Amino acid sequence: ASVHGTTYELLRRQGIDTVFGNPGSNELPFLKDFPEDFRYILALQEACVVGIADGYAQASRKPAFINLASAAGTGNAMGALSNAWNSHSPLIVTAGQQTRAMIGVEALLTNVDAANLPRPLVKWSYEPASAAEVPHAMSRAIHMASMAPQGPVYLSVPYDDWDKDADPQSHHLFDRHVSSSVRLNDQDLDILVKALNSASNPAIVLGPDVDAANANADCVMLAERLKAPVWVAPSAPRCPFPTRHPCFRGLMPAGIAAISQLLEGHDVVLVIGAPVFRYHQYDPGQYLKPGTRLISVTCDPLEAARAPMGDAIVADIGAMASALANLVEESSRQLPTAAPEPAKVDQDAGRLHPETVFDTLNDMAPENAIYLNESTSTTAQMWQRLNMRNPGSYYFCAAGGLGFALPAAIGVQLAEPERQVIAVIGDGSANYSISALWTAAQYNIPTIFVIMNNGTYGALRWFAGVLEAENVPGLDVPGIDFRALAKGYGVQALKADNLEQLKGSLQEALSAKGPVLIEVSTVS
Template identity: 70%
Template structure:
């Protein structure tokens, strides 16, 4: 007899989902029973950190990752992290244990009441199978749904008495299934896109995270060079999709309506690739586009295409469409954009380090293929100005702005990319939301470097307090934190830096080793 448990592990094995990220409870134990030797289980001490690690792992790998949560309580703890995964199009298969079927209706302890509704709207698909024999099919569907464009998290609740039941007939067909998406635009559409770009007198391109996610940064560079276009990163970009050292690169767009419109002034065509149009933040009313400016977006997400307040949209395969445009567009006769002037190196000053000085040192010392995971939100613009990020997959940020992403994501990314050094740059306020991931880094010897920017305050909130004219607001400072003590308590080596020289020494030691290290850096508020 093939059990539901056996059938599901065969599906997972065939689909190469052999790494689990989880924090189990009693409902999940029957699923984890007799855990196969060819699988690995990465334990996290909090569900938010678990999903954050899986998020980083899946983004870096470009493939679905499996998450195992505990019923409703564990799912609730993970919801903030799910918001980031949803907005970054991260393919996660989130499983949650449910009470046994006879106990769900009476709402016994640990019953996940209305389980399929709980994680919505932060998942693409959510289900609880109606009987045990549907579990393998539901798992197979979840995997394919997570990976299909636009990829994203899905959720499957399974009563724990289902795993020992006999699987239904035909279950053997599920493990070997492959689902592919062929989403290239037709010749007429490609011709219209190329013609629009060629006929524009001053086009500009805005690239978003899906360009980096599909490995198309090189095609974006080729297209920009062919058409001599300046290139902006989309607002609040969770990935870096264009080399920051390239002469066409202009920087990170702000997240306000009026500010974006001002920066796009003078361009008759805006081509947005792999990004929402646009992900605004602070309310800054104004014209969505300058007068006389046309916008065309290429996206893999029908929801992003439909909700955009302006412009035309093409829903298509990002990598293939960019490559085709780069190959077919004619070479522009106009000169290339003038390269940005890199900011001068920050001067050494007494006292806590200026963030500019921290990033100058980091840029000088880190390997050129380093991966940066950012959650120092108040210094994001400085980071984009001063770090040379040129490789595919060099930068990650919380796509929904939810704190607690960077520290666990750095662990997951380093696990997926052991050949590159991962450096998390994290504010002292943000670090507390995912601090439990330090334990996982120590236990599995995952050699990420965690650079804590310690200034004793929520810097981004202080900036917003000024924008919103909100005076005398409580709760903006976080004094008295000792991240070196916290790190050592979780088993991670910790170093303290309060000057350029101590930061240089600490980074040199961390980069030379093969173990996780936290560096607490005293910075200015």
């Protein structure tokens, strides 16, 4: 067998059947003879390729396979890899290299010092030293991406390797099963459970790895048993809990002082599947107030090591959440009271308040909708106004890198064809990965894109305000016609300049057969 044939067999045997890519010449020997049982999803720029794959992996809860065009293609994707690193997304990023005989002279398309290129944003990065090693290296890549803590990996392959003979002993790779589905030993788990049972006023904080593990329901049971309020850890990349459950308390503000104040009076705070914590703004003060003990369960040693406070346990989130939910006592304390209904912001017949948009989406979208957020000045309101009952219902750029949501929404929609995906994206953010729209059109992936157009980088204007920073350039983005961009890439386009038009456009979009972009005129 060839390296090509063996590698595709390995991929298939390991459950991979889709290649997200933008091709180049070093990849043609890999992509030729493309298997009939595989899917290739083309995108027009590599940030888009990787964003789509990332959404697909996050929603599918399985690795996604990517093929990029040597160094330039890899490089174009590195912002997308920054997000994937923070979301623990299991991405197998492959790129073609020059033929081995031309690497030394640094022929055009040689990826120099290739393994160092995507560092430090990958868990493992490698170029094999021979053709026959390629299937083994691919096996390593699959497993490295997939073991907890999951994350992106990089493999560079000289294009002449594919046609070479494989090692027959590579057949041992095909059916390897590698598990990291582990939990704390019984003795220490019993100690933890006793501490939770004995807490007088516990609180729970959940991060994205809960949703990635589909541990959401177990966390609901845990919160009900402990009668504990539940927050989502700051800068949330995913939604780990039903947002109208009575225990839910919403998104934590991303500040040191704000979080210790929120946790004041809680004697034990159990954090599951989050860094401790993904703060953002400068908000100095106490990490925790006196009387609060924090215990973190994380899938990532790097998270456990860097937490500035608390105990930590490094284990699989699904295994731990299930064990804890089934072991803790039912507290006789009263169940927390549900958060009040959000206020309705006054809305005239002109430009839309973002709150109006979210309320309308919540009114009109199906109960199993999936939202993506890259409307950076409106996140807090979005989190308050969308009832997200189910797992896998929310994604936000995990490293804060714009250009995620537009392509990721396409990948999520590909992963979840029965769940309507609605990406709410600011006018500024929409441009970073605008060409991803084409993939939705070409493959008829029926994502809805809601562009919040206020003509400015609003979140930056806000942050400049708190700085009292004057004379900052580059904050306004006037003069972008998103309906024309959608037309450019073959996506049906609608406008919403007021509330009646927003409702009309959403109705039309929700009943459409393909992707739809709605340009919403929002308040500045």
